[PDB]
Each structure stands twice: as C-alpha cells, then as structure tokens.
Design a binder for this molecule. Structure first.
Ligand SMILES: *[C@@H]1O[C@H](CO)[C@@H](O[C@@H]2O[C@H](CO)[C@@H](O[C@@H]3O[C@H](CO)[C@@H](O)[C@H](O[C@H]4O[C@H](CO)[C@@H](O)[C@H](O)[C@@H]4O)[C@@H]3O)[C@H](O)[C@H]2NC(C)=O)[C@H](O)[C@H]1NC(C)=O
Ligand SMILES: *[C@@H]1O[C@H](CO)[C@@H](O[C@@H]2O[C@H](CO)[C@@H](O)[C@H](O)[C@H]2NC(C)=O)[C@H](O)[C@H]1NC(C)=O
Ligand SMILES: *[C@@H]1O[C@H](CO)[C@@H](O[C@@H]2O[C@H](CO)[C@@H](O)[C@H](O)[C@H]2NC(C)=O)[C@H](O)[C@H]1NC(C)=O
Ligand SMILES: *[C@@H]1O[C@H](CO)[C@@H](O[C@@H]2O[C@H](CO)[C@@H](O)[C@H](O)[C@H]2NC(C)=O)[C@H](O)[C@H]1NC(C)=O
Ligand SMILES: *[C@@H]1O[C@H](CO)[C@@H](O[C@@H]2O[C@H](CO)[C@@H](O)[C@H](O)[C@H]2NC(C)=O)[C@H](O)[C@H]1NC(C)=O
Ligand SMILES: *[C@@H]1O[C@H](CO)[C@@H](O)[C@H](O)[C@H]1NC(C)=O
Ligand SMILES: *[C@@H]1O[C@H](CO)[C@@H](O)[C@H](O)[C@H]1NC(C)=O
Ligand SMILES: *[C@@H]1O[C@H](CO)[C@@H](O)[C@H](O)[C@H]1NC(C)=O
Lengths: 51, 45, 109, 134, 43
C-alpha cells in the first residue's frame, strides 16, 4: 500500500533443503549420564529412568 | 520482556493487507513445507 | 540444434541450454553421426577412462558457472553431437536428455 | 566384450506390435543393469525407459506407456515390444546399460539425495520403416 | 524540535487514501496542475 511494504520470501536458491540441528552423540550421551545420575540421586538412589 | 517485545513491535509494518485469498501451489517438482503462494495485493496506488 | 563453428587448435567452450536450476550433475555424450555414441564427463568432474585429456569437465561451485564442456585442441575426431544431460535437483528426475548441438570445425587442413 | 546384438523384423505396418531383442554376451546379466535407448531421424536420442533387477519396468510418460519392455534370463536377452506401432516409429533402436549412480546433496537419513542414471556401453541399433511397403 | 514536530503531527488527519491515480491535466494558463481523482466519501 502507500508508504506500506512487506518483505516476502524469494526463490530458495540451490536445492530445496530443510533446517537441521546436529548434536554430538558422545557429548549428549555423557551429559544424559550426568543428568540421569543426579535424577536417580534425587528420585531414590538408582531407578529405571527412560528419557 | 513482554513489554519490551511489544514496544519494539508497535512501530514496524502492519500486515493487515496480507489477509487475502492465496492461490497457492507446491515447489517440490517430484517426490509440503514450501508453498509457492500467488495472491493479490494493493500496490502504492 | 545449435551449429557451432570452431577453428582448429586453441580452446573451445561448449555450454548447453537448460539452466542449472539448483545443484546440477551433468552428463555429456558424443553422438557421432551414424555410429554409436559415448559418454565423456560425468558427475561434473569424473571423466571415464578411454577419453582424451583434450576434454575437461566443469567442476561445480554450487552456483555460477553452467554445464560447460571444454574442448582443448579440437581435432578431426570431434565432429559429432554434444549432449547436455543435466540432473538438476530442482527439476527432479532428469528423464529427458535435452536437445542436440553440433560442432562443425572450420579452418581444418 | 559386452556386445548388445539387436535383431528386429525391419518391416512393420501401423498399429501392430514390433519386437526387437538385445542379446548380451561376454559379461554376466546379474552384475549390472541394462535399459533401452532409441533415436529418431530428425530428432535427438529418445529413451524407451529403463528396466532394473526388480523388473518393475519404469516406462516413459512421453511415450504414453504404449510400449512393452521386459527381459529373459534363459536366452540372456533384453526384450522390447512395441504394441500399436505409431507411424512415427520409423527410428533406430539402440540398447543401453544402466549404472545406478548415487548423487547425494544432503543427508541420507532424511532422503535428501537422488539417483542419477549413468550409461557406459551402448549397442548399434536397427532402423525400421512403418508403412504399407514391405 | 524533531520530537515536537512528530508529536504534533500525530493527532491530525492521515492522508493515506489520497494515494490514487490522479488524472491530472495542465491548469488554465507548469507550477500548477489541475488534478481530478477519486476519494472515498463518508459511506
Ligand atoms: C549436520 O547434519 C548432518 C549430520 O551428520 C551432516 O550433513 C551434511 O550436510 C552437508 C551439507 O551441508 C552434506 O554435503 C554434501 O555431501 C555430498 C556427499 O557426496 C556432496 O556431494 C555435496 O557436495 C556439494 O557440492 C558439490 C560441488 O558444488 C555439489 O555438486 C553438490 O550438489 C553439493 O552441493 C555436499 O558436500 C553432507 O553430505 C551431509 N552429511 C554428512 C555425512 O556430512 C553434517 O554434519 C551437518 N550438516 C550441515 C552442517 O550442513
Ligand atoms: C513460484 O511461482 C512463480 C510464478 O510462476 C515463479 O516465478 C516466475 O517464474 C517464471 C518462470 O517459471 C518467470 O518467467 C517469472 O518471471 C517468475 N516471476 C513471476 C513474477 O511470475 C517462482 O519461481 C516460483 N517459485 C518457486 C520456488 O517455485
Ligand atoms: C487477482 O485479481 C485478478 C483481477 O482480474 C483476478 O483475476 C480473475 O480471476 C478469476 C478467478 O478468480 C478469473 O475467472 C478471471 O478471468 C480473472 N480475470 C482476469 C482479467 O485475469 C485474480 O483471480 C485475483 N487473484 C486472486 C489470488 O484473488
Ligand atoms: C479544475 O478542473 C475543475 C473541473 O473541470 C474546474 O471546476 C469546474 O469548472 C467548470 C467550468 O469550467 C464548472 O462548471 C464546474 O462546476 C467546476 N467544478 C466541478 C465540480 O466540475 C476547476 O475550475 C479547474 N481549476 C482550474 C483553476 O483550472
Ligand atoms: C474514479 O472511478 C471511476 C470508476 O468508474 C473511473 O471511471 C472510469 O474512468 C475511465 C477513464 O479512466 C473511463 O474510461 C470509464 O468509462 C469510467 N467509468 C465510469 C463508469 O465512469 C474514474 O475515471 C475514476 N477517476 C479518475 C479521475 O480517474
Ligand atoms: C559446529 O561447528 C564448528 C565449526 O563452526 C565445529 O568445530 C563443531 O564441531 C560443530 N559441532 C558439531 C556438533 O557438529
Ligand atoms: C501440494 O499441494 C497439495 C494441495 O493442493 C497438498 O496436499 C500437498 O501436500 C502439497 N505438497 C506436495 C508435496 O504435493
Ligand atoms: C503540460 O504539463 C506538462 C507536465 O510535465 C508540462 O511539461 C507542460 O509544459 C504543460 N503544458 C504544455 C503546453 O504541454
């Protein structure tokens, strides 16, 4: 409109892909081990915990 | 944070003319998440 | 069809018609008139054995340059058909082989 | 020497079935894949489609799938049948291999890739005429 | 002065409907153009 403009999305240059998050499996496993350890300490001493 | 976000959003462009019948198709030629939408919009005049 | 006239020697550049909409994987063929054709450059860099070094591929930088075939020192054996069979991702399956272009070398003793 | 012998009737009338074979020798038939490729005088190379190990003949949308392709392992030949021969079928019919090439532009987990078909060895082809002449 | 100008310009009339195709001809005689155009009335 007059004095009005909206920024639309242009053609996606290159192959049509998708956003993706990469988490190091080793780091995530070790941190999950640390959290599950404290969770087991918080909830009893050692209990079955499923993330 | 709510007040700051609302204040930083007040002066920017309002998009009330975007409500329109979107004649929209796909972008993936072969085997959504990317919709090529053609629609009408009021120009400057 | 595109008749190209190239002087003997030096270098020649063969670019094809279809635009590289998205990342491309081009295939170039040599259809000599009358006899069976062959393939020259595939995967945009990989040239199969039994092909002279006079034909160099076009590496992809994900944009910019198109599917170009390079002729380095044309000879009497290159009078044939050049086929640009490009597998651009945006166009999906490259079922079609595209059109045909002919090079007709001039200045040939 | 994988020599792709092809033999056809050579004479055909409109609206009937054409039969050209593709004899394979010098190399096995289960190692790789083979397809069919044609070419019309005045036109560029045209492709009948491709047949792979699973035998699900992927046919040509540009040829209306009015063609019948198959293969036989006993006689070791690739089979191409052209039922309802169109008067435009005056063309040479080669025979081609099919390399199941892999071209990945993203991750394999999400199906962010596609297969490109590479062809290495081709035949010699035979030309047929479709008219009242015989 | 900038802020004063802004704050006093706010309460007065916005002219967003004036943007229209002005079918304008030369005034009876440049420096003056007689333009006939369209406007949205009360209804
Ligand atoms: C996070 O996600 C995964 C985690 O494992 C992984 O994804 C990788 O993403 C990149 C792209 O960012 C992929 O890259 C392609 O890999 C193929 C492999 O054959 C290449 O051929 C591709 O080449 C490009 O460049 C060529 C020359 O211009 C083009 O012709 C071609 O089309 C391509 O554009 C390209 O490099 C990669 O395969 C995946 N997967 C792996 C295992 O790397 C990666 O860790 C992260 N991805 C990110 C950060 O984008
Ligand atoms: C979405 O659709 C538009 C309209 O078809 C595409 O843009 C046009 O593309 C054609 C070629 O196909 C050009 O001739 C036009 O100039 C383009 N613009 C206009 C204003 O029509 C656009 O590329 C499509 N986007 C995607 C990613 O598919
Ligand atoms: C944008 O405005 C044009 C104005 O003409 C619309 O065009 C008509 O669209 C109808 C279908 O909705 C057709 O039957 C008419 O023939 C079109 N007229 C002309 C002259 O093209 C168009 O549909 C509008 N687009 C949207 C998204 O609403
Ligand atoms: C600008 O144009 C308008 C419209 O023609 C002029 O006003 C009209 O003038 C005619 C006589 O020429 C009168 O009969 C009308 O009643 C007037 N008004 C309307 C509503 O049409 C106006 O005078 C022109 N201005 C100048 C200075 O040229
Ligand atoms: C105001 O809107 C009317 C809507 O009809 C416009 O009228 C048309 O104007 C064109 C010339 O631009 C004429 O060919 C038509 O015959 C007119 N239609 C009618 C029903 O009168 C009018 O032009 C607009 N105002 C201006 C000054 O452009
Ligand atoms: C994130 O990117 C940096 C480089 O910018 C790299 O060193 C690091 O290993 C990446 N992390 C993961 C989990 O891929
Ligand atoms: C395309 O549009 C249709 C609706 O017209 C929708 O159902 C479909 O999911 C879209 N995308 C694809 C990949 O077909
Ligand atoms: C009419 O209007 C135009 C507007 O640009 C002006 O240049 C011109 O001098 C005016 N008069 C005549 C006689 O054209």
């Amino acid at each position: 409109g007059p004095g009005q403009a909206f920024y639309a999305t242009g053609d996606i240059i290159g192959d049509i892909r998708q956003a993706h998050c990469n988490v190091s499996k080793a780091t995530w496993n070790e941190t999950l081990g640390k959290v599950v350890k404290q969770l087991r300490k918080h909830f009893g001493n050692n209990t079955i915990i499923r993330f | 944070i709510i007040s700051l976000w609302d204040q930083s959003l007040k002066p920017c462009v309002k998009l009330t003319p975007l409500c329109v019948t979107l004649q929209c198709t796909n972008v993936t030629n072969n085997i959504g998440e990317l919709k090529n939408c053609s629609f009408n919009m009021t120009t400057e005049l | 069809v595109r008749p190209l006239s190239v002087a003997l020697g030096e270098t020649a550049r063969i670019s094809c018609g279809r635009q590289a909409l998205g990342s491309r994987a081009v295939q170039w063929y040599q259809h000599r008139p009358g006899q069976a054709p062959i393939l020259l450059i595939y995967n945009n860099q990989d040239r199969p054995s039994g092909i002279p070094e006079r034909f160099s591929g076009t590496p992809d930088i994900n944009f910019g340059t198109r599917a170009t075939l390079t002729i380095s020192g044309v000879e009497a054996g290159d009078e044939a058909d050049y086929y640009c069979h490009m597998w651009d991702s945006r166009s999906g399956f490259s079922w079609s082989f595209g059109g045909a272009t002919r090079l007709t070398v001039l200045g040939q003793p | 020497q994988v020599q792709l012998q092809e033999s056809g009737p050579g004479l055909v009338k409109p609206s009937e079935t054409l039969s050209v074979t593709c004899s394979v020798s010098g190399d096995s038939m289960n190692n790789y894949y083979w397809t069919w490729i044609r070419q019309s005088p005045g036109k560029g190379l045209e492709w009948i489609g491709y047949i792979s190990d699973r035998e699900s003949a992927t046919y040509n949308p540009s040829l209306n799938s009015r063609v019948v392709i198959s293969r036989d392992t006993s006689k070791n030949q690739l089979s191409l049948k052209l039922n309802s021969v169109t008067p435009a079928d005056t063309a040479v019919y080669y025979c081609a291999t099919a390399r199941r090439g892999q071209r990945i532009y993203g991750v394999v987990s999400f199906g962010e890739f596609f297969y490109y078909y590479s062809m290495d060895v081709w035949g010699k082809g035979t030309t047929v005429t479709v008219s009242s002449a015989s």
